[PDB]
Design a protein around this ligand. Structure first.
Ligand SMILES: */C=C/C(=O)O[C@H](C(=O)NCc1cccc(OC)c1OC)c1ccc([N+](=O)[O-])cc1
Ligand SMILES: [Cl-]
Lengths: 305, 300
C-alpha cells in the first residue's frame, strides 16, 4: 500500500533529449527519427524576443547556424521549418533510441510527467497537471526551455507538452508538440499573467477515493447530495463544476469502495465548509488535485511499462 | 522558479530490472554485469515465512530452480549465493545496459528515487527519504519486492535500497544492496513494529532556506536560540535532535540567504507554536522534511 506523486519511468524520453544552440541561445530539443523539435524562440536574441518576426528571423538562417549535440556527438542539420511555435530541424541521422510515440493535446485537469533537462542532459522527473488556467506548477531554472511532458500507455510514449517560458508569478507555459500554446500565451517578452486558477474537483474526489482505499476514512459521513446542490458549493470555493461525465469516470472507484460520487461529494462539501479540523488525508493538510481517476486506479492496481 | 519533489531520471535503472521466479514466487531482480540481486525470501513458501532457515532452504536449490527473465529473454543461472538478506544469482550474459554504479548504505534523513516494478516491468518513479525509524513511506503493491532506490550523481548510479516488505503500519522496510536491513527488521513474518517516526529537523531547515531563496520571508522573526534550547522545544513536537553536524551542513545555505542557522531555528520554533495561519510555504500547508540540504542546493 501507500500513495505517492508518481511519474512515468523516463527512460524512453531520456534517449531523445539533445542540446540545440543558435548563436548565443542554448536549450533542449527532442530527437525523434530524423527530426529535432524545440521552441522557435531559440532563433531570438534580446533584441528579437521584444517583438519577433519569426518567418523573417528564420529565413536568415544557415542550417549550419543550428548546433545539435546528442550527448558528446555532433548532429548535422540538413533542414529547418516551423509548425506554429515549434522549430523542426531535419538531421542526417535517425535516433536509434526512437521509441514508439505520438503527439497528443491534453485537457486541463489531465496529468503528465516532465523530464527537466539542462543542455540536453536530463536532470529530474516530476508529475504535473495542466491547470484550468493552462499553466503548470513546475520546477524550472534557466535553460530548461524545450523540456517535455509525456504519458506512457503500454510501450507508446504520448508527448503532450514542451516548456517555452516562465510567467512572472513562478508558474510555466508551453505548447503541444505541434507548437500550439496551452492557454492565452505568446512566445514574446511582453506583460503576460496567469488567469485566476481553480481546483480540479474530479481530481480531489479521485484523491479522497485513494485515501479511503489506503484506510484514511475519517471524512466519510452518512449523507448524499445532488450535482446542482454540490456545484453551488463548488462555484463558491473556486472549484471547477462537476459534470455527469466526471461522475461516470469515478464509477469504478465508487464500486470498489462503496462510496457513491455524490456520497463522497457530501464529504468534500463538509471539508470545504468546516475545514479538516487539524487532521490530514494521505499526510496532506491541503486537498490535492493533481491525481486523475486513472492515476488512482493505475497506482492502486499495479499497471507497468 | 518553482520547487517540486523531483526524482532522478529512471532510465539507467530501467535497463537493469528483471523478473526472478522460484517455485510459485515471482518478484523483481537487479541485473548488474553478470549478477542478479533480489530478496532471499524469493526461496520461501507461505509456511516458511515465520521461522525460515535460509541456509537450509538454499542448499536444497539448484541453479535451474531460478527462472530469470529480462524482457522476453530467459537468462541462464550458472551460480547462486546468499549475502546477508540478498540472493546473488550468477548468469551467463553480462547486462549490456549496466551503467556506472556503486552500492551505498544511507543514513536516516537521506533522500532517493524509487523505481516501482512488477514482474520486472517498471511502473513508476517517486522520491522519498529514509525515516529516522529506518522505514520509508513508499507506494508498493504485492510483487513490488526487489524494487530499488537510488541516487544519480553525474552518470554514476548509487544503489542504496532494495524493497523486502510492508510493516503492519503500511510503511516499507528493506536492505542496502549488500543485503543488510535498515533498522531492526528481519525477513520473517514475526511481530515487528517501527520505532516512533520523527520529523527530519535538518531537512525542514533546508526547505525553509529554500523558501527564503524563492523569495518567501513571512515566517522569519528577530529572535535567535541556543542549540540546546532549540532541541528542548523541537523534541516536544517529535522533531529529531539537531546536531553540530546538521548546523555545519546548513553553513552554505546560511551564507547564501544571510540568515544564521540558529536564527532559522528560532523561525521553526515559532512555526511549531503558531502553525501557518492559513498560509503555505512553497505550496505546502505542512513543514516538508523529505528535501536534504544537498537537494535544496541542487534544485535552487
Ligand atoms: C513483495 C511484497 C510482498 O507481498 O511482501 C510481503 C508483504 O509485505 N506482505 C503484505 C502485507 C503485510 C501486512 C499488511 C498488509 O496489508 C495492509 C500487506 O499487504 C500489502 C512480505 C514479504 C516477506 C516477508 N518476510 O518474510 O519478511 C513478509 C511479508
Ligand atoms: Cl513527482
Amino acid at each position: 500500500s501507500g500513495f505517492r506523486k508518481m511519474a512515468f519511468p523516463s527512460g524512453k524520453v531520456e534517449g531523445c533529449m539533445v542540446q540545440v544552440t543558435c548563436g548565443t541561445t542554448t536549450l533542449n530539443g527532442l530527437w525523434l527519427d530524423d527530426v529535432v523539435y524545440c521552441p522557435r524562440h531559440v532563433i531570438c536574441t534580446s533584441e528579437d524576443m521584444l517583438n519577433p518576426n519569426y518567418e523573417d528571423l528564420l529565413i536568415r538562417k544557415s542550417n549550419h547556424n543550428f548546433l545539435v549535440q546528442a550527448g558528446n556527438v555532433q548532429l548535422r542539420v540538413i533542414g529547418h521549418s516551423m509548425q506554429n511555435c515549434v522549430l523542426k530541424l531535419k538531421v542526417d541521422t535517425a535516433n536509434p533510441k526512437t521509441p514508439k510515440y505520438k503527439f497528443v493535446r491534453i485537457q486541463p485537469g489531465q496529468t503528465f510527467s516532465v523530464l527537466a533537462c539542462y543542455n540536453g542532459s536530463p536532470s529530474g522527473v516530476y508529475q504535473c497537471a495542466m491547470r484550468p488556467n493552462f499553466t503548470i506548477k513546475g520546477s524550472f531554472l534557466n535553460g530548461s526551455c524545450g523540456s517535455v511532458g509525456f504519458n506512457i500507455d503500454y510501450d507508446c510514449v504520448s508527448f503532450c507538452y514542451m516548456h517555452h517560458m516562465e510567467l512572472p508569478t513562478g508558474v510555466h507555459a508551453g505548447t503541444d508538440l505541434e507548437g500550439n500554446f496551452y492557454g492565452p500565451f505568446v512566445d514574446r517578452q511582453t506583460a503576460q499573467a496567469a488567469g485566476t486558477d481553480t481546483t480540479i474537483t474530479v481530481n480531489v474526489l479521485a484523491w479522497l477515493y485513494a485515501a479511503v482505499i489506503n484506510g484514511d476514512r475519517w471524512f466519510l459521513n452518512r449523507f448524499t447530495t445532488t450535482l446542482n446542490d454540490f456545484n453551488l458549493v463548488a462555484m463558491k470555493y473556486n472549484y471547477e463544476p462537476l459534470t455527469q461525465d466526471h461522475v461516470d469516470i469515478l464509477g469504478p472507484l465508487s464500486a470498489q469502495t462503496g462510496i457513491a460520487v455524490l456520497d463522497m461529494c457530501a464529504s468534500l462539501k463538509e471539508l470545504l465548509q468546516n475545514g479538516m479540523n487539524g487532521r490530514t488525508i494521505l499526510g496532506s493538510a491541503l486537498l490535492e488535485d493533481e491525481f486523475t481517476p486513472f492515476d488512482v486506479v493505475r497506482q492502486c492496481s499495479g499497471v507497468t511499462f
